[PDB]
Amino acid sequence: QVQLQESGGGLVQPGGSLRLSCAASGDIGGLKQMGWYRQAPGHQRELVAVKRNENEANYTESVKGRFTISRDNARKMVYLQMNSLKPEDTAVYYCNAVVGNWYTSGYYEDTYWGQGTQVTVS
Amino acid sequence: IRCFITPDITSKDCPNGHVCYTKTWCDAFCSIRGKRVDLGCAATCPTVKTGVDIQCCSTDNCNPFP
Structure with a gap:
């Protein structure tokens, strides 16, 4: 019904750079928000970046100035440019998308998640 | 023709469109939430599948x- 498929992860040295991409497909009618979260061993799915339609992008102050989230709506995709990577940025990055749709009973938002892609720095 | 459109459910002027339509259809949540509702405009009354109901007006x- 909604598929988020990720790509771009890999292994990099400290100071390198990467570019993750998340493609949404299927019933993306009413796609309303998209974000990148990270999870490292022992952590939860922590906020990295997020973009809600008609709002300003929000970042965690641990990555401001180094990461950049962007959304191409004609392609229905969200991308994360990861500059000046550092070892603490190592983790599995997931992309979530919140889609909003109307039913006879009202307007509901639903969160779908991506397969997850590894990012390692060493 | 000015029609209501979703997700904003607001009125919008549709060039080359002659009909407003309300299209209702069940998704995976039809039993819990209700029948998905899509408001739109078209040049002709859209042709729909079997389980998809449509109401066209001018x-x-x-x-x-x-």
């Missing part, structure tokens, strides 16, 4: 939300 802003 007036301006004649596809409000139930």
Whole structure:
């Protein structure tokens, strides 16, 4: 019904750079928000970046100035440019998308998640 | 023809469109939430599948939300 498929992860040295991409497909009618979260061993799915339609992008102050989230709506995709990577940025990055749709009973938002892609720095 | 459109359920002027339509259809949540509702405009009354109901009208802003 909604598929988020990720790509771009890999292994990099400290100071390198990467570019993750998340493609949404299927019933993306009413796609309303998209974000990148990270999870490292022992952590939860922590906020990295997020973009809600008609709002300003929000970042965690641990990555401001180094990461950049962007959304191409004609392609229905969200991308994360990861500059000046550092070892603490190592983790599995997931992309979530919140889609909003109307039913006879009202307007509901639903969160779908991506397969997850590894990012390692060493 | 000016029609109501989703997700904003707001009126919008549609060039080359002659009909407002309300299209209702079940998704995976039809039993919990209700029948998905899509408001739109078209040049001709859209042809729909079997389980998809459609209501077409010619007036301006004649596809409000139930």
